[PDB]
C-alpha cells in the first residue's frame, strides 16, 4: 500500500500472508473460518506454499504466529487469466487455524448486498509502499 | 517492502466511472476503489478490501490488479466478492 499507515497490531485478525518455501511473502489472503482462506487466483498458490496467520511484523522472531499448511487449492473455474476476471481462489487448510484475539474471520456478503460508490472502506497488506 | 502491516482507507467507485480510467478491462466481477491519494500495490494481491456493514467488517473485494506504478490518482481493481460468493458457498458445502 502506497501512502497508507501502520496498523494497530492484531487489529485485522483475518489478514494472512502467503509465503513460499523460502519465506518470501508474495500475496495476502483472508480467513473466512478456521479451515479456509480466500485469496486471488492470480497469486498462483500451490500446496508447497504456507499460510501465515497472526502476523504483524514480518521482521520479528517473537510473535506467536501460526504457519499453516495447505491441503488443496480451489481456483474458481470461471477465472480467466487473460483478463484477470473472477480472480478468486480458496485454500483449504490441512491444519485448522486456532482463533484467538489476533486470528479470526472476516464476514462474507450476501450476493444481493449493495456497497455504494463513495463508501469509505479499508484495505490492508504487506505490499510495496513505494514503486 | 514494509515489515509491518499497513492499512489505508479509500472510496469505492462505480464500474461506469472506473471505465473512464481502464476502459473495457473492467468486467462485472470487478470493483474499483481508490484514486484518492492511496493505492494497493504489488504484494497486496489476494488481501482484503473490507467495508463495515451493520457493525461488522465484510469482505467486499480481493486485491487484484491496477497500475504498474501504483499511481495514487488511478483506481485499483479488486475482485467483486458479491459476484463470487455463491461459488464460495458451493465450494465450502461440497468440501
Amino acid at each position: 500500500i502506497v501512502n497508507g499507515e501502520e496498523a494497530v497490531p492484531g487489529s485485522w485478525p483475518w489478514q494472512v500472508s502467503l509465503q513460499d518455501k523460502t519465506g518470501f511473502h508474495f500475496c495476502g489472503g483472508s480467513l473466512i473460518n478456521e479451515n479456509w482462506v480466500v485469496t486471488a487466483a492470480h497469486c498462483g498458490v500451490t500446496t508447497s506454499d504456507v499460510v501465515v496467520a497472526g502476523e504483524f511484523d514480518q521482521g520479528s522472531s517473537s510473535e506467536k504466529i501460526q504457519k499453516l499448511k495447505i491441503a488443496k487449492v480451489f481456483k474458481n473455474s470461471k477465472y480467466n487469466s487473460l483478463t484477470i476476471n473472477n480472480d478468486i481462489t480458496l485454500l483449504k487448510l490441512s491444519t485448522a487455524a486456532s482463533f484467538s484475539q489476533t486470528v479470526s474471520a472476516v464476514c462474507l456478503p450476501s450476493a444481493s448486498d449493495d456497497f455504494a460508490a463513495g463508501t469509505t472502506c479499508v484495505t490492508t497488506g504487506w505490499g510495496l509502499t513505494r514503486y | 517492502t514494509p515489515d509491518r502491516l499497513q492499512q489505508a482507507s479509500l472510496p469505492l467507485l462505480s464500474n461506469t466511472n472506473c471505465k473512464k480510467y481502464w476502459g473495457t478491462k473492467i468486467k462485472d466481477a470487478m470493483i474499483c476503489a481508490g484514486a484518492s491519494g492511496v493505492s494497493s500495490c504489488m504484494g497486496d494481491s489476494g488481501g482484503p478490501l473490507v467495508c463495515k456493514k451493520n457493525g461488522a467488517w465484510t469482505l467486499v473485494g480481493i486485491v487484484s490488479w491496477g497500475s504498474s506504478t501504483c499511481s495514487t490518482s488511478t483506481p485499483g481493481v479488486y475482485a467483486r466478492v458479491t459476484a463470487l460468493v455463491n461459488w464460495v458457498q458451493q465450494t465450502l458445502a461440497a468440501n
Binding site: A7, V8, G10, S11, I32, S104, A105, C107, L108, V122 | -
Partner: peptide, 10 residues
C-alpha cells in the same frame, strides 16, 4: 465474523 477483538484505529 467481522468483529476484531483488538479494535482498528484509522
Amino acid at each position: 465474523c467481522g468483529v476484531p477483538a483488538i479494535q482498528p484505529v484509522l
